[PDB]
């Protein structure tokens, strides 16, 4: 996260670190004890992924850490056959052994279709993730967070040459300075409405990072929230 700030341990009970080929290549968000969520573009064919719940400082072994192994990775049906690789850029990771829910391992709330959009347009949201602190300068050793203002279509559409699909939305500071960068994808974009915090879009992509005229573009969770609902059912 470029231009953000360091998060306090325990401040993000759903923020998950995704280790795989090379590690810390993506983040994720706990939907519930068994299944986490992340962006489809993190699923590299043939690699084994380990979710690192409860992680904080990468240089040290936090006693809260709870690793798991992905046994199934279900990207959204209509993800990318060979077209815009960030459309339904979302996927569900099914951990083998359930995590131990606690102060440091708590799921995020999934609102229905309506309310998710409602909480999105409230204006601001938190984006947390372990990644590049400088636009291609170094990765996040200690979990970082930033508050990013939802950026309207009219402006988004103009800043990018890329067809900003319905499936997504823009968000970021108008001037160059703060934004999510490489090594953040799949992370969360949450909007807290009076204490309780909900998911409003998975953190997907962006042309470079921290440069004016550009905004980070995220996945409109509102679109697949229901898919998530049916996909993670326990009973």
């Amino acid at each position: 996260i470029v231009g953000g700030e360091n998060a306090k341990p325990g401040q993000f009970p759903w923020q998950v670190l995704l280790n795989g080929k090379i590690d810390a290549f993506c983040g994720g968000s706990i939907i519930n004890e068994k299944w986490v969520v992340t962006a489809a573009h993190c699923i590299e064919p043939g690699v084994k992924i380990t979710v690192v719940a409860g992680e904080y400082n990468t240089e040290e072994t936090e006693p809260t850490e709870q690793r798991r192994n992905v046994i199934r990775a279900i990207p959204h049906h209509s993800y990318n056959a060979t077209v815009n690789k960030y459309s339904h850029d979302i996927a569900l990771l099914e951990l083998d052994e359930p995590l131990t829910l606690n102060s440091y391992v708590t799921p995020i709330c999934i609102a229905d279709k309506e309310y998710t959009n409602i909480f999105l347009k409230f204006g601001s949201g938190y984006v947390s993730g372990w990644g590049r602190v400088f636009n291609r300068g170094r990765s996040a050793t200690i979990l970082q967070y930033l508050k990013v203002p939802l950026v309207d279509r009219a402006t988004c559409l103009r800043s990018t040459k890329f067809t900003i699909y319905s499936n997504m939305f823009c968000a970021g500071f108008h001037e160059g300075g703060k934004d999510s960068c490489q090594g953040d994808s799949g992370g969360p974009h949450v909007t807290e409405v009076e204490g309780t915090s909900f998911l409003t879009g998975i953190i997907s992509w962006g042309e470079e990072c921290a440069v004016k005229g550009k905004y980070g573009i995220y996945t409109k969770v509102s679109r697949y929230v229901n898919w998530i609902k049916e996909k993670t059912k326990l009973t």
């Binding site: 325990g10 993000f12 829910l101 102060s103 440091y104 708590t106 807290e192 309780t196 915090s197």
Partner: protein, 146 residues
């Protein structure tokens, strides 16, 4: 009453002084101590309880004051006198989480998986030691990040 023989010199007992005959506010105050609690012991006692013949209908709870009075309406009713019905668009329908109209015209609240609807029919209380979306370190045990 303050009329016997050295009855100030005794600790006030408002059982005694106040609603025998009728007490003063000071008599009532030194005996109450917390004087929030005196202000309202108060507005009920006399000046014609503006809450006269309960204005707020639809089960509304009228709460009188010195001068004015207001109304607590529980659920499904809006307006200073709970006359108007709560519709899901004016102030979230009074529900703390999700509300939808249905089967008629009045609201109906709900909560996300993990929480349950409180007895007021508008609030959400957990139903799992670890409900979705709550920063746990700050809360535990019963604190807040100041």
């Amino acid at each position: 009453y303050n009329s016997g023989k050295l009855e100030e010199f005794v600790r006030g007992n408002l059982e005694r002084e106040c609603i025998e005959e009728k007490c003063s506010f000071e008599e009532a105050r030194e005996v109450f101590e917390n004087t929030e609690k005196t202000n309202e012991f108060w507005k009920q006692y006399v000046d014609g309880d503006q809450c006269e013949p309960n204005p707020c209908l639809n089960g509304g709870l009228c709460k009188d004051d010195i001068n004015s009075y207001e109304c607590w309406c529980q659920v499904g009713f809006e307006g200073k006198n709970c006359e108007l019905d709560a519709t899901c668009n004016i102030k979230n329908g009074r529900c703390k989480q999700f509300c939808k109209t249905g089967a008629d015209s009045k609201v109906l609240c709900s909560c996300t998986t993990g929480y349950r609807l409180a007895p007021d029919q508008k609030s959400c209380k957990p139903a799992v030691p670890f409900p979705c979306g709550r920063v746990s370190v700050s809360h535990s045990p019963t604190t807040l990040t100041r």
